[PDB]
Amino acid sequence: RPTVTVFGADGKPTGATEVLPKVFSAPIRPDIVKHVHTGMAKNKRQPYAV
Partner RNA sequence: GGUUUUGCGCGAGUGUUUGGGUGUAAAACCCGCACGCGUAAUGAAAGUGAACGUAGGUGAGAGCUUCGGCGCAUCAUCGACC
Q: Among 11, 27, 39, 50, which residue interacts with other proteins (rule: CB under 8 A)?
A: 27
Euclidean distance between CA atoms 40 and 48, whole angstroms = 19
DSSP 1-50: --EEEEE-TTSSEEEEEEEPPGGGGS---HHHHHHHHHHHTTTT------
Q: Is there binding between residue 5 and other proteins (CB under 8 A)?
A: yes
Q: Among 46, 48, 49, 50, which residue interacts with RNA (rule: CB under 7 A)?
A: 46
20 touches which of other proteins, RNA, none (CB within 5 to 8 A by kind)? other proteins
CB of 44 to RNA, least distance (A): 5
